Ligand binder design. Structure first.
Ligand SMILES: O[C@@H]1[C@@H](O)[C@H](O[C@@H]2CO[C@H](F)[C@H](O)[C@H]2O)OC[C@H]1O
Length: 329
């Protein structure tokens, strides 16, 4: 009751969001009502959860998420239309198991985007149209995917044009992770610059911020913000969490975070939100990929079956030390 509300603390800076599903909306309902003014579907607006078979649309769970958000004056970010994961095999196949043509995959992509975006038009204000198309390793610009293989390299500009036609008032985003490592930052910058230089309706870059205690550095975060902001696009932080484990640290035995971990995490969140506040003119939304440590995808990624403690509230929904530093910047 005397705890500050995240969305009020940052009222003049950016919206505060959380990724949810209908279970976690129930299990974490009071945290959400007390703190966020933005909602993202953690899984139930991905292609496999909206059109699991061709012409079979399953909007029920996404509807419950949107209904919750509208009944509490929360905005909604749509996630996500075209992605190399969580997309059923039928999308790329014909009746005979072969791959479909460029023209056929384009009409399936258009129909999906059209049906999904039209249903939520006027309730969902922005869409992650393309998710994680840039390569995470190597020297090529683009990751391989059936979207890219079948259609060609312009599959992304098609996706953006189809979504703009379906809802020209939505802000359309390119969304990606490890967005602050310099070599991937430059690929993301080059890709988005080239699309905008063609007049493609891409309005925003989504910085997932699946970060650790050490990586990326505050200087890499600042440089990435300024690099993306220089394109004239809107910036959203879309999946923020702060893992207690570096990428090399695949330990399964840890039953509670050390007090060093907890303290470094608090400091890390303080520095991150100070940096965000400083760039309040280009960042308009900060969404955590969860809200409290009783639900996080990091419990099973990248290591199945361990436990992580990445968010501002603990498993009993009490503020962590990180909370106090985050709201005091
Ligand atoms: O439950 C998991 C879900 O949380 C996760 O969502 C992705 C996490 O990394 C980024 F934010 C992606 O763009 C999200 O869609 O991954 C899938 C699911 O198993």
């Amino acid at each position: 009751s005397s705890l500050p509300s995240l969305r009020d603390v940052f009222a003049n800076d950016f919206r505060i969001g959380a990724a949810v599903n209908p279970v976690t909306i129930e299990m974490q309902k009071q945290l959400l009502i007390d703190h966020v003014n933005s909602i993202t579907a953690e899984n139930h607006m991905k292609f496999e959860h909206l059109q699991p078979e061709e012409g079979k649309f399953t909007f029920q769970e996404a509807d419950r998420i949107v209904d919750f958000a509208c009944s509490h004056r929360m905005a909604v970010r749509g996630h996500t239309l075209v992605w190399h994961n969580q997309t059923p095999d039928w999308v790329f196949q014909d009746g005979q198991g072969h791959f479909v043509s460029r023209d056929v995959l384009l009409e399936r992509m258009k129909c999906h985007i059209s049906t999904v975006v039209r249903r939520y038009k006027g309730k969902i204000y922005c869409w992650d149209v393309i998710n994680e198309a840039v390569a995470d390793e190597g020297n090529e610009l683009l990751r391989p995917s059936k979207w890219r293989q079948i259609i060609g390299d312009d599959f992304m500009e098609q996706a953006f044009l189809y979504a703009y036609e379906a809802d020209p008032d939505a802000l359309l985003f390119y969304n990606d992770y490890n967005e602050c490592f310099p070599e991937k930052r430059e690929k993301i910058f080059a890709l988005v610059k080239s699309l905008r230089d063609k007049g493609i309706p891409i309005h925003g870059i989504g910085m997932q911020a699946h970060w650790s205690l050490t990586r990326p550095s505050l200087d890499e975060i600042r440089a990435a913000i300024e690099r993306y902001a220089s394109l004239g696009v809107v910036l959203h932080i879309t999946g923020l969490d702060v893992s207690m484990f570096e990428f090399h640290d695949r330990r399964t035995d840890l039953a509670a975070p050390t007090s060093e971990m907890i303290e470094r995490q608090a400091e890390r969140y303080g520095q991150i939100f100070a940096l965000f506040k400083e760039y309040r003119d280009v960042i308009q939304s900060v969404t955590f990929w969860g809200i409290a440590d009783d639900h996080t995808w990091l419990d099973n990624f990248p290591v199945h079956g361990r436990k992580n403690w990445p968010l501002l509230f603990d498993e009993q929904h009490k503020p962590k030390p990180a909370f106090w530093r985050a709201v005091s910047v």
